């Protein structure tokens, strides 16, 4: 999609694991999505396996971590998302496509474009925006700001 | 050892509601009352004679129970909208009067009165010191009269005439009807009790005492299929997951290892070459037949728009696609996916088989490719089938009050397959020149596997048209036919798994499923109609009471909340203010209207006969004698406001224009302020002689507010201080300003009693279909609408 009227927007989120957009609104967006799927079925088993996957999100809402140092063992509160889970490769890719869709809707109050592609891989992504007029040196410094 | 290190995390409560399926919406509780609706109570006040002195006796008067009436004229009309909401929940469905019956302690013979509050008033007046001999003799002859032939009772009462107009209305208009064993057998729909296959039986015959509450099944008055394309999409999806769980599954299919082995020899599939006949067997098993039979019946009972799904290189999925379009009406599949399936039949099965050039179909043409190819084709047997597909439509007839959409009489017979299997039996005989010989073999082989099952496929069309016409009889809400937003996808591979895996075994829906599908369509259609009438009655009653400052977003939000299937927080304020433009034009139910005209007629008597409020001051600047009353002694009360200009305070508190009431206070002109206005009370003659009542009006000029207005209401009696000025010197007390105020009505015992009449005993039954216990005739003898049975052919 590369041309002289488009630009690519790759952003490097520094601490993806423990940001504020990952603790409460990410675990409550999955729990709310498993309650619209408990009204779409009629078996007694499919309601149960959608209730147990919901139960792993309420328990990880307030999770403590254990780090040993010296003699003492520290217990630190950590309600965020780390790796080593099972869903962390397919649910981190949903939280990016919902966060970069909200940022590209707030930047469209200053410019007028048409998003060609968005592609997410964990926490490194890009998005190709196609503009009306030709891309200049001022439309690159003021989109990045 | 452990060291705890905790931090803050900000909370985040998303706006969510609790959604339920249609299978579990419980009916509401039957409202009954346990005490009478009282809004007035008696009270013992002292009495004063004409001079101003205090007499030895007392007197009873009516006063309000909990007179919490607010100041300001707009907050009184807001209070009577809240009182009208309290009566609509307090009103009972049935009222058995013998449950509220307290023994009368003083009587000729020990009878009963109607309430605990009724026997408290009778006891205090009887034991009173100053009571007269006539009223005390009247409480002795106060008992009930029981008639046992017609089961009625007459319990005595003591109520205000506004109280009597509310409790007499609750006894005359009850929601109970008598119940026999003929009203149970008419609760079942007419197509099921007149069915041959179901034998209906019951055990106990109910008495003549037994009553029941009838639901209101009248069709929807909002027209939610008309320009509400997001509230209709989630009211017909929730109607589809219910009808998916009711349509039965198939028993005794053809054994799959004995059918696919016969099928794989007729295709004669070679183990070496890539041909188009190895794809004729992909995806045929027992599970794909039980999920295509359900999604055909359950979509028709809910009017979901289906959507076909297929692959063009599978020719057997295109001959099974010739069977849906000649049975299911084409006004049900979505047009961007019905046309792309009709085009694949034409360019592969029909137009190559006749030797003509394949058609060039452009996007968005107004004619479907079957509607073009009946003009261009020249055969007769394949242009007669092709005319039924273009004119296959639902027939909207109204049976038993419910407009439901009926299939054609040829699909319901099975005679439509004898038009199909004579059309694709001539298309197999037409040799065709423009294609290679290995293409003629692959169409002629796959058209033979369907034309060998013609005995067991007429019998399939009679099963779809019978398991859909029986489950049609169990709905009550009006089924309408519009294109929905989201589509329920049907897979065309799983239609091949139904046409050639069925045989010789009828499945018929058991009556324990029919009596459950019927009892959750009544519980939703009745709940849909008791939330309209609870919401039209507040929208109309807020436009009659002139509430120009209230917005009806909140009371349409409450109407969507009680219907358990809609989520509120994703419905905007555009689709909720357009809804109360349809809830306004409806006429309100006759029980909510008569209980509102009883409030609107005497909403000025409940307001006037209370303390902590007054209806505005009159100002005279002229020395006027204040009137004498028996309960107040001497009091400055003006009973009627005439002869004076009026400056109402609600118009002065809305516009804020204080140019007139300032220029009328400075020039000393007589004026009469009008509005709900709180007052204070004093009792001293020195606060009258020193004229402390014309002082409180000078705050409207210095400030601008009128909310802190507190007039004076004098009260000069014998127990007041400095009364000897009134008795010694010959003067009536003369004031300047007086209060617009009314005098509470005297309480007379012999004229305020009543005789409440109601029944002795009911027995209210809620579930009616727990008495009948139906059973189905053996499914090998199952009789269709014509008396020849379904699933008969070998």
UniProtKB/TrEMBL annotation, chain A:
<feature type="binding site">
    <location>
        <position position="92"/>
    </location>
    <ligand>
        <name>UTP</name>
    </ligand>
</feature>
<feature type="binding site">
    <location>
        <position position="17"/>
    </location>
    <ligand>
        <name>UTP</name>
    </ligand>
</feature>
<protein>
    <recommendedName>
        <fullName>RNA-directed RNA polymerase</fullName>
    </recommendedName>
</protein>
<comment type="subunit">
    <text>Interacts with VP3 (Potential). Interacts with VP2; this interaction activates VP1. Interacts with NSP5; this interaction is probably necessary for the formation of functional virus factories. Interacts with NSP2; this interaction is weak.</text>
</comment>
<feature type="binding site">
    <location>
        <position position="88"/>
    </location>
    <ligand>
        <name>UTP</name>
    </ligand>
</feature>
<comment type="similarity">
    <text>Belongs to the reoviridae RNA-directed RNA polymerase family.</text>
</comment>
<comment type="function">
    <text>RNA-directed RNA polymerase that is involved in both transcription and genome replication. Together with VP3 capping enzyme, forms an enzyme complex positioned near the channels situated at each of the five-fold vertices of the core. Following infection, the outermost layer of the virus is lost, leaving a double-layered particle (DLP) made up of the core and VP6 shell. VP1 then catalyzes the transcription of fully conservative plus-strand genomic RNAs that are extruded through the DLP's channels into the cytoplasm where they function as mRNAs for translation of viral proteins.</text>
</comment>
<comment type="subunit">
    <text>Interacts with VP3. Interacts with VP2; this interaction activates VP1. Interacts with NSP5; this interaction is probably necessary for the formation of functional virus factories. Interacts with NSP2; this interaction is weak.</text>
</comment>
<feature type="domain" description="RdRp catalytic">
    <location>
        <begin position="1"/>
        <end position="145"/>
    </location>
</feature>
TrEMBL record, chain B:
<dbReference type="GO" id="GO:0039625">
    <property type="term" value="C:viral inner capsid"/>
</dbReference>
<dbReference type="Pfam" id="PF05087">
    <property type="entry name" value="Rota_VP2"/>
</dbReference>
<dbReference type="GO" id="GO:0003723">
    <property type="term" value="F:RNA binding"/>
</dbReference>
<protein>
    <recommendedName>
        <fullName>Inner capsid protein VP2</fullName>
    </recommendedName>
</protein>
<keyword id="KW-1153">Inner capsid protein</keyword>
<keyword id="KW-0946">Virion</keyword>
<feature type="region of interest" description="Hydrophobic">
    <location>
        <begin position="308"/>
        <end position="328"/>
    </location>
</feature>
<feature type="site" description="Interaction with the intermediate capsid protein VP6">
    <location>
        <position position="755"/>
    </location>
</feature>
<dbReference type="GO" id="GO:0019013">
    <property type="term" value="C:viral nucleocapsid"/>
</dbReference>
<comment type="subunit">
    <text>Homodecamer; each decamer is made up of two conformers of VP2, called VP2A and VP2B. Interacts with a VP1-VP3 complex. Interacts with the intermediate capsid protein VP6. Interacts with NSP5. Interacts (via N-terminus) with NSP2.</text>
</comment>
<keyword id="KW-1141">T=2 icosahedral capsid protein</keyword>
<feature type="site" description="Interaction with the intermediate capsid protein VP6">
    <location>
        <position position="138"/>
    </location>
</feature>
<feature type="site" description="Interaction with the intermediate capsid protein VP6">
    <location>
        <position position="753"/>
    </location>
</feature>
<keyword id="KW-0832">Ubl conjugation</keyword>
<keyword id="KW-0694">RNA-binding</keyword>
<dbReference type="InterPro" id="IPR007779">
    <property type="entry name" value="Rotavirus_VP2"/>
</dbReference>
<feature type="region of interest" description="Hydrophobic">
    <location>
        <begin position="336"/>
        <end position="356"/>
    </location>
</feature>
<keyword id="KW-0167">Capsid protein</keyword>
<keyword id="KW-0677">Repeat</keyword>
<dbReference type="GO" id="GO:0039616">
    <property type="term" value="C:T=2 icosahedral viral capsid"/>
</dbReference>
<feature type="site" description="Interaction with the intermediate capsid protein VP6">
    <location>
        <position position="142"/>
    </location>
</feature>
<comment type="similarity">
    <text>Belongs to the rotavirus VP2 family.</text>
</comment>
